[PDB]
Amino acid sequence: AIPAFHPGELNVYSAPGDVADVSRALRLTGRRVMLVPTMGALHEGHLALVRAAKRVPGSVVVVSIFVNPMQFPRTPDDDLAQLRAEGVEIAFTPTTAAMYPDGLRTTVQPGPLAAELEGGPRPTHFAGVLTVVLKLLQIVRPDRVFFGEKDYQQLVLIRQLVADFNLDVAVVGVPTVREADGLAMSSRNRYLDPAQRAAAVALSAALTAAAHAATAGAQAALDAARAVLDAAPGVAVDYLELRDIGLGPMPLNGSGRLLVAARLGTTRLLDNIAIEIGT
Amino acid sequence: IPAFHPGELNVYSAPGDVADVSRALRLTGRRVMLVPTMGALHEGHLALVRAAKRVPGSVVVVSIFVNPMQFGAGGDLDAYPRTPDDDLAQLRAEGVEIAFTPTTAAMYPDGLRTTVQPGPLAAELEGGPRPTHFAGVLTVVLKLLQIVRPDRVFFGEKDYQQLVLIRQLVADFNLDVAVVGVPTVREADGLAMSSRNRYLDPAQRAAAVALSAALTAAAHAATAGAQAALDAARAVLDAAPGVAVDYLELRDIGLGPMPLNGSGRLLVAARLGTTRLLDNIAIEIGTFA
């Protein structure tokens, strides 16, 4: 006997079998299930994942909120009021024991991309993320799953998961939401003192400088970015990397993605941007 | 969807094709049964198929795919028996409606990239000296489950450690599938069926009944307790011609980090010349026996 679903309001479920039943049962009524997986502490970035999911005709929106200890802020009532306010019908808020009842056992092993870039400082981060995402996919069985482009390496790895395991979901990447000066929305931004928040602008400045310098080629794009980062105090750059769209080596011409990460005090920030060489 | 002819054997080599047909069928009410195999089909595989057929309103998908990922390098893979001619003839004769026979290229377009990493059970027993073996198995079973999306999937108990790890896969990744273990079909003398029985010469074939004999002996000796079960099994194996034991182990039914209570599984693995043979049996320690 299917758990109660109240159409047009915010239905919260902690039990994975519950949301699974509501989901299956809604699919059959003709709704398309959309999954927005989050760690909670929601900001405008998350509301844009939600918004893109609501505009699918016939959509019902599932937002998961789960702090995944496997890969690594806890505003629980706030988060729900924020989803209520977006017209979201399902929140899935499992516990750690419910997600891992047999503890840590079978896990996803990422390919070699997971040892690069963000995988430098956090070599197990992505195995934990893929493990949890695969689980949510199997619990919710969404037609579409939504991820920010902010975490670009993470999005590419997800697409690799989906491809490699023959998963039957569409992965939608949603452009980064940004503050008025260009800073990419992040849970972390709140830690920045004013000096830091000031210097932080350099990351988005540098990328967009590069995207525009790139009619003059790859080297000019990279040199422009480096100069802008070099103009910022207290910004310790961990990498600045132009890659192909899939994150393999950057081709000679054609589409690319430029990524950067840097520490400002104890806070690590990421940003990335589309790049077209000689275009 | 591509052509589907009911009541006939339909063969698909594209994952998209069987996936499309699977889903159309499931949408019409039928329940999808998956029997994953490596071909060289014998009577134990037919018990799987039969158990699948007795699930009502089912359609049976049998996959045949020699998965290169579960093979340790040098020669085992090339040495694997392949008889797609017999295999397909048996499936027709059983009334199986769908065979899925993928290419390596279709299953691994990017080579090894994302994979399944088994829990700690995968390094024990068969996985000890074959440390990548079960990662290979779990990865293709997950992919098959995702292509086919069946309601139930069927495995033999002969490869007991495999079935347990698969149950682990299914629970740990929250897969929407019921796993059915099917009891081991045996030759008239007790020899467990295996694609690899064909590698035993007449003398080796005769000696081989030692495995199932040791085990059914232990299973009866077990009212006298665990040392008695284990020494009965050992004594039978010791008296057999050219049976070299690699392990004989008594474990909990989940094989895992529990001690044995009164219900266990006794597992044996032994070499007969170059052929490696597995068998195992349910054990109840006495009072439960």
Ligand SMILES: COc1ccc2c(CC(=O)O)coc2c1
């Ligand atoms: C859409 O713009 C964004 C920006 C960030 C995020 C995040 C995580 C973060 O806080 O780092 C999830 O979705 C986002 C979407």
Ligand SMILES: COc1ccc2c(CC(=O)O)coc2c1
């Ligand atoms: C049901 O009995 C069996 C026995 C063995 C097997 C096998 C493996 C093998 O051929 O070695 C696959 O399915 C079986 C089913």
